[PDB]
Amino acid sequence: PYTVVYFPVRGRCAALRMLLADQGQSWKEEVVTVETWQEGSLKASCLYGQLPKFQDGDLTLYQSNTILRHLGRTLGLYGKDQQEAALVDMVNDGVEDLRCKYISLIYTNYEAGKDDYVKALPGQLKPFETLLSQNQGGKTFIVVDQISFADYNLLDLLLIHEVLAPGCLDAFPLLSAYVGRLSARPKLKAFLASPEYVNLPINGNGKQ
Amino acid sequence: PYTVVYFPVRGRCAALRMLLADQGQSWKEEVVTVETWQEGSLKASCLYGQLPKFQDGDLTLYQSNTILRHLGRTLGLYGKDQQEAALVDMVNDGVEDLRCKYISLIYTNYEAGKDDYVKALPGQLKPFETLLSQNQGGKTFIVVDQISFADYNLLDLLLIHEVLAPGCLDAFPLLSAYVGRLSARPKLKAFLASPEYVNLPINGNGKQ
Numbered sequence: 374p375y376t377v378v379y380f381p382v383r384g385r386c387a388a389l390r391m392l393l394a395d396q397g398q399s400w401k402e403e404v405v406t407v408e409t410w411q412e413g414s415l416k417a418s419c420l421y422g423q424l425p426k427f428q429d430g431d432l433t434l435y436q437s438n439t440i441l442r443h444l445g446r447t448l449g450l451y452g453k454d455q456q457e458a459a460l461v462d463m464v465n466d467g468v469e470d471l472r473c474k475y476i477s478l479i480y481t482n483y484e485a486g487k488d489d490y491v492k493a494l495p496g497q498l499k500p501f502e503t504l505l506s507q508n509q510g511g512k513t514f515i516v517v518d519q520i521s522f523a524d525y526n527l528l529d530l531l532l533i534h535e536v537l538a539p540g541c542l543d544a545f546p547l548l549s550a551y552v553g554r555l556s557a558r559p560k561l562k563a564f565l566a567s568p569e570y571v572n573l574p575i576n577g578n579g580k581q
Numbered sequence: 582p583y584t585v586v587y588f589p590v591r592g593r594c595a596a597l598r599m600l601l602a603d604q605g606q607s608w609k610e611e612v613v614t615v616e617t618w619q620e621g622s623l624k625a626s627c628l629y630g631q632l633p634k635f636q637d638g639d640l641t642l643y644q645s646n647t648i649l650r651h652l653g654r655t656l657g658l659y660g661k662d663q664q665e666a667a668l669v670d671m672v673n674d675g676v677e678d679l680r681c682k683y684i685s686l687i688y689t690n691y692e693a694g695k696d697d698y699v700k701a702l703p704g705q706l707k708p709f710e711t712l713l714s715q716n717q718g719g720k721t722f723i724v725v726d727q728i729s730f731a732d733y734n735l736l737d738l739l740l741i742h743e744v745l746a747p748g749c750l751d752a753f754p755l756l757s758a759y760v761g762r763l764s765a766r767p768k769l770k771a772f773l774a775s776p777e778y779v780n781l782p783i784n785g786n787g788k789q
């Protein structure tokens with residue numbers, strides 16, 4: 374039913390994969406090697422010439438966040454009403470912004486900018502700690518009483534930053550208990566421990 | 582009912598403003614000067630320390646695309662069903678990606694990178710021409726049979742690029758007729774000609 378076409382890395386597919394796994398959904402991984410990509414055919418066929426590419430039946434989607442919102446809508450991980458939907462988006466857009474900065478660091482200037490980035494990290498993470506503190510004392514999910522696609526995206530963002538800068542969550546008790554709690558969810562826990570996840574690099578240039 | 586808190590520029594609020602105007606909605610513009618911003622209070626109160634800030638009743642939102650999707654949901658500019666909603670997102674995410682590149686050029690290296698950017702423009706615009714060609718011959722809207730929040734965002738993206746690189750749409754007949762057509766919509770036409778729009782700079786550093 375579901376098919377994700379992507380390079381052999383976690384990157385922009387980690388979140389949607391966690392979502393599918395934690396939601397007990399089944400999907401096909403179509404791995405695209407750098408050689409196959411350099412060939413040019415596939416790329417030229419991609420709407421924006423990039424991956425991931427997602428297939429739900431004959432519905433073909435591009436853009437990682439479009440995929441997340443699509444699954445969020447179809448799997449009921451988008452809040453209970455319009456107001457909640459807006460809050461979920463607000464969280465996901467914030468996650469996306471930080472992911473872009475992370476991606477820029479990793480691929481553009483890991484060596485030179487890693488110091489400043491880590492220094493500015495606390496200020497970038499604080500918003501999510503604040504969101505949690507304003508939602509049932511940070512005991513449930515990021516913004517509503519049920520898990521949303523934004524939670525999976527946030528969870529990944531947090532996991533990869535703990536690798537980039539160990540202990541970055543030590544200053545944020547809600548985020549820490551949040552990561553621990555969500556990572557404990559049965560299907561998600563099993564997935565995160567699987568080779569399918571563990572044996573794929575976070576990024577494509579060996580940096581993390 | 583609606584209130585947009587932003588700097589005195591079109592920037593990331595141009596699209597939502599066109600949407601509100603074309604939809605016959607009323608809103609309050611709360612202008613934030615650079616001096617008021619440098620003061621720090623407001624910024625510290627912003628979820629991600631940035632503007633725009635949007636208020637719909639006591640619902641406070643941040644993130645321009647969250648605002649667009651919120652209005653799209655509440656005003657019925659998000660398609661008719663889930664599949665269409667996904668297609669609308671796919672378009673908006675593409676617009677967002679190019680906007681980010683545009684924003685980087687304008688604020689990061691207008692002088693040095695303007696040449697390469699313009700050179701790469703055609704390849705960045707082509708995806709939208711393609712989207713139009715696959716939707717009722719490009720006679721209606723960007724992806725579905727009704728206007729969506731993504732249309733307004735795309736329209737703005739196109740308008741500002743024609744300023745950055747005059748004639749960039751000459752190679753794309755569907756996009757051209759698209760811009761002309763949407764700009765002709767009564768309420769939108771009146772808005773675009775108003776001082777409210779015309780007398781605000783596109784960006785904040787005087788570059789365009």
Ligand SMILES: N[C@@H](CCC(=O)N[C@@H](CS)C(=O)NCC(=O)O)C(=O)O
Nearest residue numbers: 384385422423424425436437438678
């Ligand atoms: N906004 C897109 C970004 C997609 C993207 O950056 N794709 C990269 C891999 S992470 C890619 O296809 N790189 C190869 C290329 O551009 O040819 C999304 O969120 O899906």
Ligand SMILES: N[C@@H](CCC(=O)N[C@@H](CS)C(=O)NCC(=O)O)C(=O)O
Nearest residue numbers: 470592593630631632633644645646
């Ligand atoms: N992802 C955000 C980006 C917001 C943004 O870049 N805001 C700028 C002005 S357009 C800002 O607040 N700059 C001041 C600062 O960050 O200190 C959105 O789409 O709204």
